[PDB]
Symmetry: C3
Subunit: 115 residues, 3 copies
């Protein structure tokens, strides 16, 4: 049962696994250590009162954005399923940290299977 | 597996814990965990009512999925974190908006660390 | 683990609960909840007559339809399938995709007994 989750604030990385399918590298960024099928989950809650000159863009990145969010008027789900390979780096990136509400913004991942 | 599925008509609740059926289309989550939702929503071509087409999967009273295109047969497959005490329900602006024989939803626990 | 994966080219099938029938097409032999995953990449120099359209079909029913030709698209999802069901990834024209970066896979997650 290999599962990891970053957020929401004030929480950082939580993790449970055997000995393990991933490695946490830094905030919002992990490293896949086992080829297999994974599920991503989580929530991006945009900041309504963002007062910055940068365009709202949240991306989930595989090394390649595999999920791009450009609508700052909607709370967005990150739930999905992907095949990843050992070595891959998974990262949730924000064009500015102030674009999202970090107290209601998290993402996680779980190994579903390894063919 | 901890699994529950409602519909399609004439089937009601089927179950194989982590949840408790509350009524038609509505469930109570009993454990914090990671869940997969699956299912399909088929608009009813015979609908002539005056309420706009809308179907929503609500966690508690908040929509986590919203369907407004009455010309789409939409899949409900997704992954979510739910907590104990959450209710999950599929709601319709009108029962006559969907073909009940072709509309169902299910949920399975993936893990609950 | 009951898995099958077609592609990407030149790979075809990599691999009971299912039977592979043809390129991009398989026969579900067992009831269950299945996860689909994969990727569809449009061919940016397609100039055929058919409108772009790629579909995951269960029997006669497109469970997923893609009509956006400007972006690579992910196929990840969970569906309930039944013994007998066929599953195929079909293209309105094979020129519409770059087979070198188009593939799909499936795996049985559970087969609950209600
Ligand atoms: Mg061949």
């Amino acid at each position: 049962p290999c599962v990891a989750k970053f957020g929401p604030s004030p929480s950082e990385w939580q993790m449970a696994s055997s000995e393990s399918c991933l490695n946490k590298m830094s905030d919002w960024k992990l490293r896949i250590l086992q080829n297999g099928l994974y599920a991503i989950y989580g929530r991006v809650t945009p900041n309504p009162t963002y007062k910055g000159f940068a365009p709202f863009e949240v991306q989930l990145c595989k090394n390649d954005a595999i999920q791009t969010l450009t609508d700052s008027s909607k709370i967005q789900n990150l739930g999905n399923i992907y095949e990843f390979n050992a070595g891959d780096t998974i990262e949730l990136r924000f064009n500015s940290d102030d674009q999202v509400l970090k107290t209601n913004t998290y993402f996680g991942i779980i190994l579903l299977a390894n063919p």
